[PDB]
Design a protein around this ligand. Sequence first.
Ligand SMILES: O=C(NO)c1cccc(C(=O)Nc2ccccc2)c1
Ligand SMILES: [K+]
Ligand SMILES: [K+]
Ligand SMILES: [Zn+2]
Length: 397
Amino acid sequence: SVGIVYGDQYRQLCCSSPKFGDRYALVMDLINAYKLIPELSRVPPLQWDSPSRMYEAVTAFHSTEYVDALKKLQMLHCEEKELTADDELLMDSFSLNYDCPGFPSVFDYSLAAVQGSLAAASALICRHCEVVINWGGGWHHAKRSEASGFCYLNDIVLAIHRLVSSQTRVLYVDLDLHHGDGVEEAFWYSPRVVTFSVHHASPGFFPGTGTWNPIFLNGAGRGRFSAFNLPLEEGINDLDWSNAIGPILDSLNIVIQPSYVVVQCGADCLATDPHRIFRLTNFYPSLSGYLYAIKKILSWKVPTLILGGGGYNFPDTARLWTRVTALTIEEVKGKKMTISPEIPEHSYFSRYGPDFELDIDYFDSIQKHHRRILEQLRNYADLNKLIYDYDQVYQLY
Ligand SMILES: O=C(NO)c1cccc(C(=O)Nc2ccccc2)c1
Ligand SMILES: [K+]
Ligand SMILES: [K+]
Ligand SMILES: [Zn+2]
C-alpha cells in the first residue's frame, strides 16, 4: 500500500509553528479535496510507553542535554515571564535562538515530526506499506545538539537510523533547495547510509555546505566517498534540473542497491517559492523536476519514505505535494489518478485565488560534477567491495 502520516493531534501540532503556519493543513486538505485519501493507508504517528522511552528514541541521535533544553524552551514559552540571562545563554549554546526561536509548542511540534517519520519507517520495515509519505517531516538541518534553519529535531536521521538498524543500506535523496547538511553530517562516518543532496549553493547562501570547501569533502573514515552533493547555480528549470540529477540517481541505485530510499521533497525549488532561486514547477503534461525525480525513484521498486521540508509558498507547496501524492499512488498501485486542473472547492479554496488552478502560476559545470560524482561512486564501490558494472554506469551519463 501507499501510506501517509496524519491524525487530528498530528495536524494541530504540525500547524502550531510560526514559520510554517497552517501549511500542513493546506497540504492534507488539498490531497483530501482531490479524493486521494481513500487510496491511502493512514500511518499513525508513533507514541511511547514513557518519557524514558521517548528520550531513548530521540537521543538515538540528539544529545540528552539538547533534548532537555528544547523541552525547557517550550516550558519557558508557556509562561508569561521573560527568560533569564542564564536561560538565554543556555538556549544560545544550542542555537535555540534567532531563526530557531521558541514558541509555546516548539517541543511538541518538533517531536511530532519525529513521531510521524519513525512510524513511517516502521510501516516500511514491517512491509505494511511499500511507500510512506510524511508531509509533516523532512527537517534536514537539525544537528545532534544544535537547531538550525527552523529544524529542531532531525526526524530524517532518526527514521534512517531505524531503517538501517532493522546488509541493509539506505539511500537518502535530498531535493530541497538547501543542502541537507544535518543528515549528511549524522552519517558522515557511515558507509551504509549514502546521502545525496542536490541544492543551490553560493556565497552567503544557507547553510553554506554541500560545495567546494578548495576541494569537495565526501565522508570520512569508513564513510569516505559516501556523502554526495550536486550544487547548482540559480535559475535552473525543470528539464536541466532533471537531466542533472537523473543519471546520478540511476547510478546510485545501480551501485548501492539500497534496501530503502528516503527522499526529502522540500518544495522551495519551485519558481514561485519566495526564495526565487530555482525555476522548478509542479507541471504534469515541461515535466516538473520533482515529479520526474519521484517517478524515477519509485520505478526502482525499493521501499521508500517520502518526506516534506522547505516550501514557503504554502498553496504552491500543497499544489506540488498533492501531485507527488497522486503520482505515488499511480506508480505504486498501478492505478491512474485523474486530477482536475481546477482546485476543487474545500476549506482552503480561497487560498488558491485568484486563478484557482492546480498548476502553479509560472510561465559544462554540471558535466564536471557528473565526472566527479561518477569517480566518487567508483571509489565508494571499491572501498565497500560492491560489485558493479562500470561501463553500464558510465553509459547513464
Ligand atoms: O528551507 C530551508 N531549509 O531547507 C530554510 C532554511 C533557513 C531559512 C529559510 C527561510 O527562512 N526561507 C524563507 C525565505 C523567504 C521567505 C520565507 C522563508 C529556509
Ligand atoms: K537538497
Ligand atoms: K554516509
Ligand atoms: Zn529549504
